């Protein structure tokens with residue numbers, strides 16, 4: 209069962225999520241919403257019926273080779289993963305679609321950038337993690353470069369990004385530079401340089417050791 | 419309260435066995451077909467197996483045939499999944515799910531919260547917790563905790579025992595080349611609060627029974 213990896217929609221507008229299969233219109237299709245860390249929850253079943261408790265703006269259709277989950281009047285809280293599902297009686301197995309992430313569209317928002325030197329307690333353990341935080345931005349795409357005494361770093365940082373916020377539709381992102389304490393104390397200036405659509409030019413956050 | 423509760427998840431060495439249990443409450447368990455459904459980290463839902471009310475009929479996906487055995491005890495309102503010869507492809511959150519026979523088909527109308535099964539030779543290890551100290555623009559400051567070098571997933575972080583939730587971002591963990599996990603949790607707060615308000619991150623790593631409270635100050 210083939211679904212688009214991603215669908216984007218503005219608040220109050222209508223999202224349509226497809227579920228493809230050869231003659232899928234001949235069998236019943238059911239739809240689940242899954243929020244991060246949570247179990248899936250059926251939102252449409254038997255092609256177009258709604259479980260009690262589900263808002264009327266969730267509806268479904270199924271015909272030919274395509275089933276469709278429609279979410280009308282989209283809200284920020286509709287950001288989630290959505291899966292279609294059938295029972296395949298030719299192999300006697302439940303089959304899920306590959307899932308669709310719904311992204312809510314909003315205006316561009318520049319990140320608020322913060323840099324964190326390593327703690328003394330970590331340095332005592334012999335390692336230094338330097339953390340750069342990009343807070344509450346949109347869209348998700350951003351570039352973070354690390355510079356140590358103006359020398360560009362590569363291969364020694366990792367990034368993590370939040371799921372889109374269920375209320376304000378922004379993202380946050382961390383980049384963590386990891387050095388040995390021995391290497392860390394050899395340098396003075398630690399800097400995070402951030403590029404994003406909401407910024408006129410790259411923003412740099414830095415500290416001098418001590 | 420209508421509920422499914424899965425237990426038995428944890429770390430299992432490759433090639434070894436593990437039995438999952440699912441306890442139902444709030445409904446007539448013997449009236450329902452029951453399934454196990456799994457989800458590998460970051461990937462899609464995959465149905466695994468199911469069993470009818472009197473346990474005469476069981477179905478499995480090809481990938482787990484023979485290796486996995488689904489069973490049930492209606493007296494104990496319980497579902498079980500025996501998993502033998504486990505591989506890395508079996509690493510997943512495993513959900514118990516109830517099957518509903520609708521007018522035109524079959525779907526899942528009740529799920530548990532799931533239990534994580536990590537197939538690895540790696541040892542369980544609690545995290546080290548480090549402050550991300552504040553030191554600020556426009557009236558807002560950021561602070562946080564770095565939760566470093568643990569295995570396996572998951573870790574939970576709260577702030578001020580759950581009293582602080584606004585402006586909290588707890589990032590998805592990253593797997594380091596060392597094979598250990600690390601994550602950070604941050605929060606933005608009024609910068610004027612830094613002198614007076616105490617901020618403590620509460621880190622729980624249940625697999626290692628590690629509980630850490632770290633005060634984060636300027």
Ligand SMILES: C[N+](C)(C)CCCC[C@H](N)C(=O)O
Pocket residue numbers: 295451468477517524
């Ligand atoms: C419940 N499960 C999804 C496993 C199968 C569905 C029932 C099969 C069908 N009623 C028949 O008698 O052929």
